[PDB]
Amino acid sequence: ATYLIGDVHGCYDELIALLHKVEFTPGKDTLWLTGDLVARGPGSLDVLRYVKSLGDSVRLVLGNHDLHLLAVFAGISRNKPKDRLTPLLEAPDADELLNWLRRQPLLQIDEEKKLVMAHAGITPQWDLQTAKECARDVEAVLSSDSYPFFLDAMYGDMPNNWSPELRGLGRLRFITNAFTRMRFCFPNGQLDMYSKESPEEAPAPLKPWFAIPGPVAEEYSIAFGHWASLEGKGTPEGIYALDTGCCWGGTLTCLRWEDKQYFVQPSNR
Ligand SMILES: Nc1nc2c(ncn2[C@@H]2O[C@H](COP(=O)(O)OP(=O)(O)O)[C@@H](O)[C@H]2O)c(=O)[nH]1
Ligand SMILES: [Mn+2]
Ligand SMILES: [Mn+2]
């Protein structure tokens, strides 16, 4: 079977309890994870150890907190106490875990399931070929020996409009923001990098990225996490918002793809 779980955010106990609920069995089953494996919850170290151990039985995409962890590890960004990342950063296998993490994809595609996954979704300004190319470009910089330079370049809120003519730092920054930070769009598809509210609470003319018809969403289902204030609700057919805010005292959600059946694990916090 195929299971898709939203942002874990260091909630290792909840993750294991949810996987035991569905009797997840590597070799029979595959797990998709929407990213943000780490930060806020208490068990980021255990989460990374376990997910890495799964190998081919897991399909991960990196989220904004995964990238921020990499930036802290590389000395690019400052450690925030509230992220609770010190046990992971101080672990004896930290190098092995984080060099594995930076090699993971930003985008997962299954053509037989007609299923696409990224942390924040697929901007309506991208067709599939462009999304693939952009993911490849950023994954290439992240898996290179020079990844700290890219992590430093990644921070920024502009440009917020895609163009095939984008080059250099602006191109990489847009790609990173689209895959890992996107929530709201302007009517022309341009990213808004400030509003994190629920769709009903946001200011006009902002709309969810998934409320703007895009070529990927017309042909593929899209699963994503990231947008906790959406509470996994209010999405169109074919759009699966899996982040129900476990680290926030909400729930961890698992979707079984074959029958679209949901399983939920309450937060222990
Ligand atoms: N207004 C509102 N904000 C929320 C809610 N849940 C989370 N947030 C906020 O959203 C901000 C970004 O958190 P989140 O959506 O989990 O994404 P992440 O930071 O990438 O992991 C956090 O600082 C939370 O305070 C909610 O239910 N309502
Ligand atoms: Mn998150
Ligand atoms: Mn996120």
XYZ file of C-alpha atoms and ligand atoms in Angstrom:
299
model
C 0.000 0.000 0.000
C 0.949 3.669 -0.378
C 0.806 5.998 2.632
C 1.247 9.789 2.560
C 1.961 11.673 5.805
C 2.206 15.444 6.337
C 4.736 17.504 8.306
C 6.224 15.453 11.149
C 8.177 18.300 12.811
C 10.076 16.044 15.174
C 6.914 14.281 16.394
C 8.566 10.868 16.341
C 6.191 9.183 18.808
C 3.135 10.271 16.818
C 4.723 9.170 13.551
C 5.502 5.688 14.853
C 2.059 5.349 16.439
C 0.386 6.332 13.149
C 2.509 3.901 11.134
C 1.676 1.095 13.575
C -2.024 1.992 13.216
C -1.880 1.265 9.464
C 0.612 -1.614 9.950
C 3.184 0.038 7.680
C 5.486 -2.705 6.397
C 8.556 -1.772 4.320
C 8.772 -4.114 1.346
C 4.976 -4.271 1.061
C 4.247 -0.555 1.526
C 5.744 2.784 0.536
C 5.615 5.962 2.625
C 5.535 9.472 1.138
C 6.509 12.335 3.472
C 5.748 16.010 2.713
C 8.928 17.325 4.397
C 9.505 19.423 7.503
C 10.672 16.286 9.253
C 12.445 18.371 11.890
C 12.051 21.320 14.298
C 9.638 22.272 17.111
C 8.786 18.735 18.166
C 11.161 16.972 20.527
C 12.417 14.102 18.362
C 14.011 15.442 15.172
C 17.048 13.188 15.684
C 14.957 10.017 15.924
C 12.798 11.091 12.959
C 15.814 11.562 10.692
C 17.416 8.289 11.804
C 14.214 6.349 11.103
C 13.316 7.977 7.774
C 16.874 7.494 6.491
C 16.720 3.829 7.536
C 13.680 3.323 5.282
C 15.656 3.694 2.038
C 13.551 2.858 -1.019
C 10.447 2.398 1.152
C 10.191 6.181 1.628
C 9.757 9.024 -0.879
C 10.613 12.313 0.827
C 10.487 15.913 -0.334
C 12.419 18.604 1.542
C 10.557 21.390 3.354
C 11.571 24.856 4.527
C 12.540 23.614 8.011
C 14.671 20.821 6.534
C 16.557 23.447 4.489
C 16.854 25.724 7.521
C 18.337 22.823 9.502
C 20.910 22.361 6.747
C 21.697 26.086 6.909
C 22.266 25.917 10.676
C 24.437 22.820 10.322
C 26.565 24.570 7.671
C 27.039 27.717 9.803
C 24.937 29.841 7.440
C 22.033 30.570 9.813
C 21.537 30.941 13.552
C 19.956 28.193 15.666
C 16.609 29.204 17.165
C 16.048 27.674 20.630
C 12.382 26.991 19.850
C 13.340 24.660 16.955
C 14.844 22.154 19.464
C 17.503 21.059 16.962
C 20.493 20.822 19.333
C 20.314 17.036 20.034
C 20.323 16.397 16.287
C 23.112 18.910 15.614
C 25.200 17.437 18.457
C 24.597 13.791 17.548
C 27.645 11.702 16.586
C 25.956 10.728 13.295
C 24.878 14.308 12.473
C 27.138 14.490 9.403
C 25.801 11.190 8.014
C 22.153 12.164 8.625
C 22.432 15.656 7.168
C 24.529 14.689 4.151
C 21.778 12.177 3.439
C 19.081 14.835 3.988
C 20.562 17.345 1.549
C 20.534 14.642 -1.179
C 16.764 14.194 -1.038
C 14.369 15.502 -3.705
C 12.247 18.616 -3.734
C 9.654 16.919 -5.955
C 8.232 13.380 -6.208
C 6.267 12.140 -9.255
C 4.487 8.794 -9.720
C 3.132 8.512 -13.248
C 1.089 5.350 -12.659
C -0.708 7.025 -9.758
C -0.757 10.394 -11.568
C 0.496 11.826 -8.284
C 2.835 14.749 -7.609
C 4.244 15.795 -4.219
C 6.196 18.826 -3.031
C 6.359 20.520 0.366
C 4.235 23.576 -0.482
C 2.562 22.434 -3.705
C 3.070 23.303 -7.393
C 2.850 26.957 -8.348
C 0.194 27.483 -11.063
C 2.926 29.250 -13.086
C 4.712 25.905 -13.695
C 3.950 23.095 -16.075
C 5.309 19.660 -15.190
C 8.465 19.896 -17.319
C 9.422 23.199 -15.721
C 8.743 21.897 -12.197
C 10.989 18.896 -12.943
C 13.783 21.056 -14.343
C 13.654 23.483 -11.409
C 13.686 20.664 -8.864
C 16.671 19.124 -10.636
C 18.577 22.426 -10.568
C 18.104 23.034 -6.863
C 18.689 19.386 -5.918
C 21.931 19.625 -7.872
C 23.168 22.565 -5.811
C 22.041 20.979 -2.530
C 23.842 17.709 -3.200
C 27.072 19.415 -4.307
C 30.154 20.107 -2.203
C 29.284 23.810 -2.491
C 25.835 23.554 -0.887
C 26.547 26.159 1.890
C 26.869 28.877 -0.774
C 23.468 27.963 -2.171
C 21.877 27.784 1.272
C 23.102 31.314 1.878
C 21.788 32.458 -1.502
C 18.383 30.813 -0.944
C 17.092 33.365 1.583
C 14.977 36.116 0.028
C 11.403 36.996 -0.907
C 12.000 38.122 -4.530
C 11.543 37.592 -7.379
C 7.987 36.302 -6.803
C 7.004 35.875 -10.458
C 8.231 33.001 -12.609
C 9.802 33.544 -16.002
C 11.898 31.139 -18.093
C 14.274 34.116 -18.483
C 15.051 34.191 -14.749
C 18.756 33.598 -14.145
C 21.144 33.095 -11.270
C 20.309 33.915 -7.675
C 16.784 35.140 -8.411
C 15.978 31.942 -10.285
C 17.172 29.749 -7.400
C 15.375 31.874 -4.803
C 12.086 31.694 -6.701
C 12.422 27.931 -7.123
C 13.078 27.459 -3.398
C 10.192 29.698 -2.353
C 7.754 28.017 -4.777
C 8.571 24.483 -3.600
C 8.954 25.136 0.155
C 7.257 28.396 1.246
C 4.305 29.080 -1.127
C 0.797 29.533 0.304
C -1.068 32.454 -1.322
C -0.919 33.765 -4.875
C -2.037 36.945 -6.550
C -4.535 36.399 -9.396
C -1.718 36.305 -11.963
C -0.060 33.446 -10.041
C 2.629 35.603 -8.402
C 3.749 34.417 -4.956
C 2.876 36.284 -1.769
C 5.580 35.595 0.832
C 3.925 37.250 3.842
C 0.413 35.878 4.481
C 0.317 32.613 6.460
C -3.335 32.774 7.461
C -6.147 30.483 6.461
C -7.793 31.226 3.100
C -10.870 32.701 4.817
C -8.725 35.041 6.954
C -6.406 36.319 4.204
C -6.642 39.766 2.586
C -7.948 40.216 -0.931
C -7.039 39.650 -3.698
C -4.953 36.770 -2.289
C -6.094 33.221 -3.100
C -4.620 29.781 -2.366
C -2.153 28.613 -4.978
C -4.448 25.635 -5.576
C -7.447 27.913 -6.306
C -5.730 29.120 -9.510
C -5.944 26.554 -12.346
C -2.493 25.356 -13.327
C -1.368 22.793 -15.886
C 0.044 20.296 -13.368
C -3.085 20.232 -11.223
C -5.226 19.725 -14.344
C -3.465 16.427 -15.087
C -2.096 15.221 -11.714
C -3.223 14.913 -8.146
C -1.023 17.033 -5.859
C -0.203 16.144 -2.256
C 1.538 18.729 -0.077
C 2.081 19.712 3.540
C 3.448 23.016 4.897
C 0.261 25.093 5.242
C -0.755 24.267 8.806
C -3.379 27.040 9.084
C -5.282 25.366 6.233
C -5.925 22.480 8.659
C -6.018 20.070 5.704
C -9.450 21.389 4.652
C -10.963 23.466 1.895
C -9.085 22.044 -1.074
C -10.467 21.143 -4.526
C -10.771 17.606 -5.825
C -7.321 16.212 -6.607
C -5.528 18.443 -4.053
C -4.462 16.795 -0.752
C -3.363 19.114 2.077
C -1.763 16.692 4.534
C -0.334 19.090 7.152
C -2.776 19.094 10.072
C -0.382 20.677 12.576
C 0.885 17.813 14.744
C 3.707 19.873 16.282
C 1.115 22.585 17.065
C -1.150 20.336 19.125
C -3.220 19.350 16.108
C -2.923 15.915 14.523
C -0.685 13.856 12.283
C -2.559 12.735 9.157
C -1.905 9.697 6.970
C -3.684 9.133 3.655
C -3.729 5.673 2.084
C -3.681 6.259 -1.678
C -5.400 3.079 -2.909
C -8.727 3.813 -1.199
C -8.154 7.463 -0.184
C -8.650 6.442 3.424
C -7.479 8.816 6.180
C -5.920 7.762 9.502
C -5.209 10.320 12.221
C -2.908 10.369 15.245
C -3.650 12.972 17.936
C -0.797 15.172 19.090
C 0.752 14.157 22.423
C 1.489 17.823 23.280
N -3.496 31.997 12.239
C -3.089 30.737 12.373
N -1.749 30.503 12.280
C -1.247 29.249 12.406
C -2.041 28.165 12.624
N -1.202 27.048 12.698
C 0.063 27.442 12.527
N 0.054 28.792 12.341
C 1.274 29.602 12.139
O 1.886 29.406 10.861
C 3.249 29.829 11.003
C 4.041 28.949 10.018
O 3.799 27.630 10.528
P 3.398 26.352 9.565
O 2.114 26.589 8.814
O 3.348 25.132 10.441
O 4.598 26.154 8.447
P 6.212 25.979 8.725
O 6.730 27.130 9.566
O 6.915 25.956 7.390
O 6.444 24.672 9.446
C 3.705 29.476 12.431
O 4.475 30.499 13.073
C 2.372 29.297 13.176
O 2.250 30.270 14.219
C -3.468 28.374 12.728
O -4.209 27.442 12.919
N -3.960 29.675 12.600
Mn 5.785 22.683 8.576
Mn 6.732 24.251 5.843
